Design a protein around this ligand. Structure first.
Ligand SMILES: [Zn+2]
Lengths: 103, 208, 159
RNA sequence: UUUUUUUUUU
RNA sequence: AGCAGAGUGGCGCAGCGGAAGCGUGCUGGGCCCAUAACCCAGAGGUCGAUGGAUCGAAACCAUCCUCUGCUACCA
RNA sequence: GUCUACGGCCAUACCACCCUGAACGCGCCCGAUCUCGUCUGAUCUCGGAAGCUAAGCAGGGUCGGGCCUGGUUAGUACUUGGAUGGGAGACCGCCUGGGAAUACCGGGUGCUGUAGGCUU
RNA sequence: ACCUGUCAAACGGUAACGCAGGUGUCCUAAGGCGAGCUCAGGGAGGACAGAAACCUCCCGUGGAGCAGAAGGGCAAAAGCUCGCUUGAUCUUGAUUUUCAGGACGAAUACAGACCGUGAAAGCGGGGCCUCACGAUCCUUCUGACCUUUUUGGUUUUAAGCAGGAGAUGUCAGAAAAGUUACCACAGGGAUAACUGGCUUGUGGCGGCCAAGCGUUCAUAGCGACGUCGCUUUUUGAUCCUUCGAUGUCGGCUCUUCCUAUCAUUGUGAAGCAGAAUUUACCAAGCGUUGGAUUGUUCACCCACUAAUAGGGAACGUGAGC
RNA sequence: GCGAAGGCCCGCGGCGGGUGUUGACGCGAUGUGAUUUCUGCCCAGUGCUCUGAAUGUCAAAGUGAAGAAAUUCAAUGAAGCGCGGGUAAACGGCGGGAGUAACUAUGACUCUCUUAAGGUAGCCAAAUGCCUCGUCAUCUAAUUAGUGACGCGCAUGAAUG
RNA sequence: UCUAGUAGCUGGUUCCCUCCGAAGUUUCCCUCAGGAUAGCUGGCGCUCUCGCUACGCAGUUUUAUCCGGUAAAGCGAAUGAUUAGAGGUCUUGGGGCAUCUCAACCUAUUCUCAAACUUUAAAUGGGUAAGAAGCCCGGCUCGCUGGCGUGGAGCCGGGCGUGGAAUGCGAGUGCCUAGUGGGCCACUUUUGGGAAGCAGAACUGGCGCUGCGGGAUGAACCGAACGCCGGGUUAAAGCGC
């Protein structure tokens, strides 16, 4: 799919429709000090071995694409997360198709 | 190579014709249904005889082929090669299946849906199987020819001499009067029926 | 087993009648449905919005809500030995007024007015419906013409 | 740096 | 997921601030009447690319697709 | 007796061809300055009023096709319920109720609502 | 885990390793709105041009297209071409479908915002409709002048609240390779490997018709194309009985039974001159052998013979070997 | 494999034990299985083993830097893997597809593919051959048996001797 | 010794009478010899109703009114399949030879068909309604809707009992709840299979849980269902012994 780099959508902070910059969300790195990571490390220390499951039966081949929308109002600059459906290929700001072209 | 006809006789399935859902069907044994002098006019073969089914069964294409051959062979010998016209009024459209002829294959009743084996024709009680039209003097030969073709069919059949003129749908007692009164216009082996329900130009052409 | 698809087996029930395709006639949108009146549900495949489920096609219920394009209906549905009053939203195209209720409302009117006429005329009139009574005694005239004698016909083996 | 064969008595 | 790399007449490669090649693969010609490769000659490289820098780039820089090696594994 | 604008039911209204059309109207028609749009004022948009019912449109016609409706097909085909009915079976008959569809044969060929005209 | 048509017996629901198929996607447009057009195909014409280039008129109820399979739906449409846009956005409840009337997915009408389109009425909160997907715990991002961070206060950090995402396809979601003939236990006739029982496709044995064969001649003897049966000495199909056990291949030994008769008794027919042979009837009283090879049943050969027929009895018979 | 601060091995533990009252003509670990005659080709794969590093990845500790600190970042970064070597009397493996010699049939000489080589010498319906009771001969009156031969050998074959 | 280890699996589980009385089906589960869930059962009640010195309901019909695409039928109606003649002709057609016959196409007929075809279209089906929660008058409220005394809804008074088809019946409602979650057979319908005392479905009844008369015998057939008895009479079936 091809998603344009900008779009006019509602802004919760502004209370109205505003232009937004569109980017692709990427997962941040693990904190190493989140409570779940601390608990897992405490469990993993010692002689028990592996204490939690390791997932191995992977079935999904694609991934849901999450768009980060940032308001262009300088005083607002608020962000929102907007997911679209699964797609194998994702392009942001690709060329727009036209019907008069010679194949 | 072929199962006995008693295995496929009692019309136990829904019609299973050749279509995009049923492919790989072997060709039927009978491919010719009209025999003798097909080009004869209505007025030369007035007598008609039928082999009428008396059971609700299905007749194989091989049986229809065998009956047609033996009826034709007798009527050529007795009435000449151009003194009759035989029409087989049954077309094999039902496809019968067979399960696999029995390491690398799954035996038993697992996946037991069959493959096409042959074609049979479903016939109802009182339905015509074969028809022969000839001259009025060959009545005994028509009965004899249809009698011998009975033995090729599993069930019970009756031989009936029609009250109609040849292969047409009009009674033999009224046929000549209708032709004279221009209600019946001969065309080919059959006849055309002319009503009074069209443009008057057609009526003008008929009476001109 | 078969699928749980919403429109499975609606090949004929949601098809338009022969030579009755095309534009929906506009009087169907002009019918006025008030709260409390009885409507027949009959899904039309020309309009795919607000379409009733196949289990409500041929069912009759009463209007409990009126919206801009649709109507809420309280419809009885039988589910494995219990009957429950479902609430469904159906667009206007898939419903029509039920004529059984209109007939009864007319009979109430002629009953009340017949009571008023009877009281003013000092007479008594029958108001309850009655099942078809046994036929009364009567005479049948021959008009000097003997009844025609029928007889079974001989058997003839046709083609 | 390589270059095989060539035909039957007459 | 982290690091370090790389894509080149079709190939095995060689340099960073432009002059694009070598033994091979195509082709034409010397020399002998030899059946040679040396010998000369030409064509064949958008160096996988999007933009940025600079007086200028396969070559320098950020990302994509085509992989490599090793490392890591609580939905 | 008719038309126009807007419709309802969507062929008894459609399709093919022929005849007739008074008066209003509806059109065909004339033109491109402006509004508007085109390769093209053909269409669309605009300004008109010399001519014409040839066309559209209306009414009628056709042993017309279709469509609607009725007979026939036929108490046939099928079917609820029943039997220690028949038949080796395939299937069939009867009791008790319901009950079709072609071919074939006739009749018909828009009704109408709101508003505004003509038939003076 | 899902979807289409059928099965399915004209409400709905309805099974099988039933039948015919599709899915783990694809789309900034193929989402939304408006305007303007009409598609497949065919006929007749026009320089190069021809069965297929492009131009024109006519007919065209859709016989095209609407991305995915199929069904439905659709014509100044939902199809084609342009123009403008992001209703594929921010929220609270109600409802439908599967259903236990928990959930997820998907879907339907509203309501409050903020917008798009069009002159406007209206239409639009994704795809014309029915498929295209995912819990707790954990992680990650986003939102508030948010709440906690434990004697108080400031600042980092961490925890919490709400909405997205990283996934479990065995798709209501354990983290998972093999072998056992050295084997073990609890059970199962809910279930295979024998007999037996149903069935007889296959095997085997018969019958009907008569196209031909038989020098001549359908039927002495055969018998194509077809068609009707019988048997359980073949093999299958099924899983009713038996898994707290019905000893298992073959041979040897011994008895009895069947006839679908190889011989022998008595006959009928012949393409029966005699001899030999073939066909059929009554008929199972009597007989149906000795050996080489093979574990073999089966087979094959050697040799006698009147003939060297076929079978059953828990595929007779292991407290008989 | 090992020259004793060792090789192989035991032990909860001690520079505790066995080999070892031993020292390569020794001890430990494997395979093949007298004698005779031979022991072909393959190091691509999996192992084992050597060092050139061009050297990439590479934990803890240590070093430096920013912040108020917890923290974070950067450079550095052993063995191992990677990278290049040996090695089959290590585990094992040993094909086709073409190009062709005066009746044929057969068919050396040339070139190629996977994943390196294409089964050499011998041997065989073998205790190894499905088809198969292979074909020929011999053994008998008769032989699915025996023996001797034959060679595209389902699936023979050289210390898996 | 831990240890009476665990077992969704096999075996057993002790007195009488009385009353009521099943399920082998739905959904989820590393679920298929097991559970949870709904259903079927029982128990305890409770809230009411009628009558003597009716609150309402129904495995039924009727009367109205909708819904449907199976049986049938159809193919000179669409989509597919398909047999044979006939009448015309543009023929980027062929063959035998100015040509002429075939083939092709068209038109009007004709034979035979469809679970995944259809214009048409049953029988048996399913839904709703058949009043007092109704009908008819008068007024009030609204921030919704709006040319309007508009519309819609709500609320407050008043009047009207011939109780607005037949038949039958007393209803409603709460909590707790065991067993079951292997089924099997038959008429009709129906899928796979040559078929099967085979495998898989729908509806109803039955066996399982059930004995009794008859079918000689027999789970299921026919008749009929059961406290202990006397008389009488039947069903299905019988009446030579
Ligand atoms: Zn903002």
């Amino acid at each position: 799919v091809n998603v344009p780099k900008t779009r006019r959508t509602f802004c919760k902070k502004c209370g109205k429709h505003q232009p937004h910059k569109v980017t692709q969300y990427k997962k941040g790195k693990d904190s190493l000090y989140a409570q779940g990571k601390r608990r897992y490390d405490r469990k993993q220390s010692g002689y028990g071995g592996q204490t939690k499951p390791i997932f191995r039966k992977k079935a999904k081949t694609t991934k849901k694409i999450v768009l980060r929308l940032e308001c262009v109002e300088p005083n607002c600059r608020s962000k929102r997360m907007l997911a679209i459906k699964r797609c194998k290929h994702f392009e942001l700001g690709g060329d727009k198709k036209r019907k008069g072209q010679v194949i | 190579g072929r199962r006995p006809a008693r295995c496929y006789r009692y019309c136990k399935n829904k019609p299973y014709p050749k279509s995009r859902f049923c492919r790989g069907v072997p060709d039927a044994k009978i491919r010719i249904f009209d025999l003798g002098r097909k080009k004869a006019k209505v007025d030369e073969f007035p007598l008609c005889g039928h082999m009428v089914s008396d059971e609700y069964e299905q007749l194989s294409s091989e049986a229809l082929e065998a009956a047609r051959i033996c009826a034709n062979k007798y009527m050529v010998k007795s009435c000449g090669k151009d003194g009759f016209h035989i029409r087989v009024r049954l077309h094999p459209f039902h496809v019968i299946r067979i399960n696999k002829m029995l390491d690398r294959l799954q035996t038993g009743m697992r996946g037991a849906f069959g493959k096409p084996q042959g074609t049979v024709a479903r016939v109802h009680i009182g339905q015509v199987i074969m028809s022969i039209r000839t001259k009025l003097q060959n009545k005994e030969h028509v009965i004899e020819a249809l009698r011998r073709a009975k033995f090729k069919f599993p069930g019970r059949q009756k031989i009936h001499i029609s009250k109609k003129w040849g292969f047409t749908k009009f009674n033999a007692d009224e046929f000549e009067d209708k032709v004279a009164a221009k209600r019946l216009i001969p065309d080919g082996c059959g006849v055309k029926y002319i009503p009074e329900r069209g443009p008057l130009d057609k009526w003008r052409a008929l009476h001109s | 087993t078969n699928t749980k698809g919403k429109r499975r087996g609606t090949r004929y029930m949601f098809s338009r009648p022969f030579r009755k395709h095309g534009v929906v006639p506009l009087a169907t949108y002009m019918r006025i449905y008030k709260k409390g009146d009885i409507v027949d549900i009959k899904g039309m495949g020309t309009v795919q919005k607000g379409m009733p489920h196949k289990c409500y096609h041929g069912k009759t219920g009463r209007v409990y809500n009126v919206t801009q394009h649709a109507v809420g209906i309280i419809v009885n549905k039988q589910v494995k030995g219990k009957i429950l009053a479902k609430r469904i939203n159906v667009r206007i195209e898939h419903i029509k007024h039920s004529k059984s209720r209109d007939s009864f409302l007319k009979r109430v009117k002629e009953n009340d007015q017949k009571k008023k006429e009877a009281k003013e005329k000092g007479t008594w009139v029958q108001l309850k419906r009655q099942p078809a009574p046994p036929r009364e005694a009567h005479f049948v005239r021959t008009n000097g013409k003997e009844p025609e004698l029928l007889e079974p016909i001989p058997y003839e083996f046709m083609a």
